[PDB]
Amino acid sequence: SLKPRVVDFDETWNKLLTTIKAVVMLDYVERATWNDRFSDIYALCVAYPEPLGERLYTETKIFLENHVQQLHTRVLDSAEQVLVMYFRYWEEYSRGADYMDCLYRYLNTQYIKKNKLTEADLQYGYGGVDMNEPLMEIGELALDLWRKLMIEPLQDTLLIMLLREIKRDRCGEDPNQKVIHGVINSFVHVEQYKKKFPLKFYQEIFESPFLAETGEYYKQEASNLLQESNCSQYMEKILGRLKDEEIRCRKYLHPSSYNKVIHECQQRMVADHLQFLHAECHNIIRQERRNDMANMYTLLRAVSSGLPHMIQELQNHIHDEGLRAISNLSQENMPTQFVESVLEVHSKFVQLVNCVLNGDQHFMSALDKALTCVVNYREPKSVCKAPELLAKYCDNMLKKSAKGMTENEVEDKLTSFITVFKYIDDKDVFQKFYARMLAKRLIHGLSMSMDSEETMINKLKQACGYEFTSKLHRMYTDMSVSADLNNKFNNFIKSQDTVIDLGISFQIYVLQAGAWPLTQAPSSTFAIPQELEKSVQMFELFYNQHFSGRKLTWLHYLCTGEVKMNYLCKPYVAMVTTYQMAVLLAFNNSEIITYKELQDSTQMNEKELTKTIKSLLDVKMINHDSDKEDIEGESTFSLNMNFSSKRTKFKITTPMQKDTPQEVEQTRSAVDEDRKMYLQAAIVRIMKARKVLRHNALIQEVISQSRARFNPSISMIKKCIEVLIDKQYIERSQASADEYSYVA
Amino acid sequence: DAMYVKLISSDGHEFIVKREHALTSGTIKAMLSGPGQFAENETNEVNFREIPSHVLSKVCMYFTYKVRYTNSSTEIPEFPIAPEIALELLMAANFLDC
Amino acid sequence: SKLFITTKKDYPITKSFPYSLEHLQVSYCKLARVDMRMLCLKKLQKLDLSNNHIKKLPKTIGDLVCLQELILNHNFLESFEVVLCSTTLRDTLKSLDLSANKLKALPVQICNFKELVSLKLDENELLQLPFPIGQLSKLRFLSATKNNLQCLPNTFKKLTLENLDLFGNPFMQATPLVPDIQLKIPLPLLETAARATLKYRIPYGPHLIPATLCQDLSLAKTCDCGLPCLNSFIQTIVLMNLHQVSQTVVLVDTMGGTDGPIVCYFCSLTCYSQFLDKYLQS
Amino acid sequence: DVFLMIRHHKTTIFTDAKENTTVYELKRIVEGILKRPPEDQKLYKDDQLLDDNKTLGDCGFTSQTARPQAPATVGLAFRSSGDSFEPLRVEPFSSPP
Amino acid sequence: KRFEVKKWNAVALWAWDDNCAICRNHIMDLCIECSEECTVAWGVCNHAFHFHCISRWLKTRQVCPLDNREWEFQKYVG
Ligand SMILES: [Zn+2]
Ligand SMILES: [Zn+2]
Ligand SMILES: [Zn+2]
Ligand SMILES: [Zn+2]
């Protein structure tokens, strides 16, 4: 019965020792005997006046020590089999230790866990407070005495065995996995009761020696591999060895060492020879070496310094490939060939990076830098021609000359173009050139459809913000309202109290100044033909009545019209310019008319007048009454008695050609002026931000904030600096000539 | 009885209680998880030869009370202990760790 | 009747003390251990061994029968021997001073020493006072200054004293509103039988209950509601005025503030809400 | 919910039942535990025989009466050779001091 | 006369009613600081400036730099 009673130690401990020997060395045992041993252990632990907890602890510890010693001697007595026998006795003893922990549960819980009381923890005394050779749990104590009396006396013997088999595994042989794994994780298992550093014993017994042996073995292996073969199959063999080594590490070792081993395995055959690899990857990437490039990437991403050299080498290769691609273009088709070559290079190298180098971000950055250098490639003593090429490409793709070419491939090509456009450093030049060429397209009406310009403005806005193309959009809006005003004008024609006949099919385009890239000819003083003053005056009063505080200017170098010839034997449709229309209107009055009469009637100056006369004589619509080969001030002209044209429905207006070189330098001068103002504004902005800032900080801030559109030269930045200084907005610091301050 | 654990006390009374109710006391958990390699013939006899039956009855009733009234927000009432039986249950609780 | 030894020369190395003495005092001597000889004397009432080099106290009292006031201050004692606590010394002790000693944790068996009327533990390294200090109902003088008393124990409110010197210790700030929930529901039986044994005043002893439990019940906590709880309690470090415990209290750099920490234990979670309501209303 | 303490001879079975649980469920539980056919035994309640069809709700097995913390006693009596059943020889639980 | 014109596709440019002396920008264009509220201001001295530029200039200097004369806002065009 449950009671504190006097108990003789020997009588109970004989049966208890029999059962404990049965359980530690796993053999047959009865459940009822196990229950009886629970009862016996409880009876021993608590008694009166002689508790037997201390005696039971000491005697079971002594038995465990003797058993571990017996196992150790039995294992030592049989050599060349230490691993297998050690593992067998290890699993037996470990399960036996767990079974003791279960069986001694009362001993562990209410005897041992009540003596290990260190500080004033509400229980001081009432047990073995004076603690020498500290008490430990029976499940813990069995493993502790296993490492003290079976592992340590055998440490040096175990490793030399273990390292013999693992190395034997690396030489192509097949040692049994179970025994090696059990012996290796025995070191972790033993210290499983340690609160701090459970793997410390494993690290000090079979990690550091194993790491060193792996280092030596793989150093020798790498030396042999280098001595026997060249680079390509060297990477092949290194990859095979690393894969097999990760397999072996998972096969034998503890998971916590899985990284460490491979750190010592790649650094002995990759990091110790990254000079050999780096001195050969240059020949690899610059040739059709796909698998070699992939192996190089895999090897060099593991080590710290493997990547940057390959990244730089690939950037150099891409830059050279782009330069070689875009330097051999035929003169006929610079824009499309340039764009398609840049896209071909970009596509090929993006496929290379995403298919071989796993799409690493660093390699994408290298590709972007190389193609940025290729795109902005400028010949010596010349300005970059890429923005002109891109503007011409866009215009040509939006030109009506592309017969039989639908709009979906237009969108495809037009969104491919944005990839190239993003690489343009000087986007302002492209913006201005495309503004001029789009204005020409709109005025001359040579576009696919207006949704194409929808797409253009939307794509450019996505690529560089709304303010980049805002003016363009404004120009665009003018188109979208122009026809409306035309219809509105028709309404006023039906709304005037006194209905009048214009005698002309008047059509107009209403364009906002400033936002449009059109320059008025200074003081052309062109005399309007007598017919058009009515249209001009009613449109001016229309605009004044519907728009307040606005003035309208009539540019005459783009306005056109139609002249039909029917009353003669040659009915001819002639699309004519304004100046040519006035010239023909003058000539219709008199058969012979002198140059002075042209000045009197047209009132428009000599250069443009003689240009119009040369254009008129180019297609031979009028006759010259003077045999002189030059058109002088005394030249007299007459209408052609005998005129003909194969194209009956013809035009005499000069076709819109490419921008003349003179024009491109005025455009570039305007771009430079705009750049100077933009840098001035940015400097003012930064000065408002700081009011005190070092000149180098000004340089960095302006270059950072301005690179989105153009890359200003630092020299222009200095000129902007003294331009602002001369404006008395900032002052040069008295104490520091390289410092600026606000006084404005 | 692989799902119903049977406890035989000193008097021979066989109290059959749910195994999940018996595992409340960790000592019994070790008692069943002892030698191992059980035939699983649905026979769990655990001879508590050294505890009275009239107290093993209260132990099993407490097992049911604890498993039923665990993880419950209801007003759980005090387990009744008779004055004539407290100690036997206390020492028994000590031997049972519950 | 009285004698004093104040040097190595005045201390008899071999010969024993007379028997006409009543009070013995040994001061400023290089006694590494308390001698066996001095434990054989008949009629020591007050025993002083101040300012010595004594490390371990004697295991058992040899023959002493009165030993009213044992003083061992300014010594090198580490911890009292457990066996020394269980001797007859409790039946006649009246005082015990351990000032300026390396004592770090008073053993709990000092609760059995019911006969003390004045205790001194100044300049020690006592983590906290013994928990069943309530069992020392005859104690009147207590001093544990310059110690690290983060929290006085629960039973401290039972004692009635005249003075209490405790200034100079780290007093942890009271956390009435932040409990430390160690309670478990359903109360495992042992707390329930245990709560029961004590509720019914079932006289028990180590010959009837297995010994380990016999310790736990001896010092089982008492909740404020009035019922014991061996385990599964709620501990709250609550400050209480110490003028109830002792007539006079001495503190440092605090005028009008006499509060001290006390580890109040709670039997059940539902019982804790009543204390929270009481504290909120007060 | 109610909990039942079946007491057959030197045996005691602890079961869970609801007020709407049928007696045949208890009979099947005893079948499973004691590996004997169910129709043999008849459950009892203080010498008042209980039939198969009616459920425990009409018996008196209320929640306030048969709590998990103190299950109600239900008798049991197996089958002898033929069609004779033993009486309620229920061994009482030993006397506490 | 008998011969006439049947079509005329005119082109027109409309603006406000040229280069600023403060922000060094076109008067009808947007100033440096600007955003759609940047109207123009015409003064007595027959000078048209941006509203923001003249507003920030008058905060410390009350005279027109062009003629060294006090600036008076004749009218605002917006
Ligand atoms: Zn309470
Ligand atoms: Zn503005
Ligand atoms: Zn002015
Ligand atoms: Zn301005």
Residue numbers in the entry:
A (entry chain A): 2 to 745
B (entry chain C): 15 to 112
C (entry chain L): 134 to 415
D (entry chain B): 2 to 98
E (entry chain R): 20 to 36, 40 to 56, 65 to 108
Paper text:
When vertebrate replisomes from neighboring origins converge, the Mcm7 subunit of the replicative helicase, CMG, is ubiquitylated by the E3 ubiquitin ligase, CRL2Lrr1. CRL2Lrr1 has five subunits: a Cul2 scaffold, a RING domain-containing Rbx1 subunit that catalyzes ubiquitin transfer, a heterodimeric adaptor formed by Elongins B and C (EloBC), and a putative substrate-recognition subunit, Lrr1, that is linked to Cul2 via EloBC. The structures reveal that CRL2Lrr1 adopts an unusually open architecture, in which the putative substrate-recognition subunit, Lrr1, is located far from the catalytic module that catalyzes ubiquitin transfer. Our structure, coupled with bioinformatic analysis, revealed that X. laevis Lrr1 has four major domains: an N-terminal PH domain predicted by AlphaFold, a central LRR domain, a VHL box and a C-terminal treble cleft zinc finger.
As observed for other CRLs, the tethering of these two domains shows considerable heterogeneity. Using 3D classification, we identified multiple classes in which the Cul2 WHB domain and the Rbx1 RING domain adopt different conformations relative to one another. We focused our refinement on two classes that represent the extremes of the motion. State 1 represents a conformation in which the Cul2 WHB domain and the RING domain of Rbx1 are closely packed together and have reasonably well-resolved density. The close packing of these domains would sterically hinder the addition of a ubiquitin-like moiety called NEDD8 to the K689 residue of the Cul2 WHB domain. Neddylation stimulates E3 ubiquitin ligase activity and is necessary for CMG disassembly in Xenopus egg extracts. The RING domain of Rbx1 and the last domain of Cul2, a WHB domain, are tethered to the side of Cul2. CRL2Lrr1 is constructed around a canonical dimer of Cul2 and Rbx1. The N-terminus of Rbx1 contributes a central β-strand to the β-sheet of the Cul2 α/β-domain, explaining why these two proteins exist as an obligate complex. The nominal resolution of the best-resolved map is 3.1 Å.
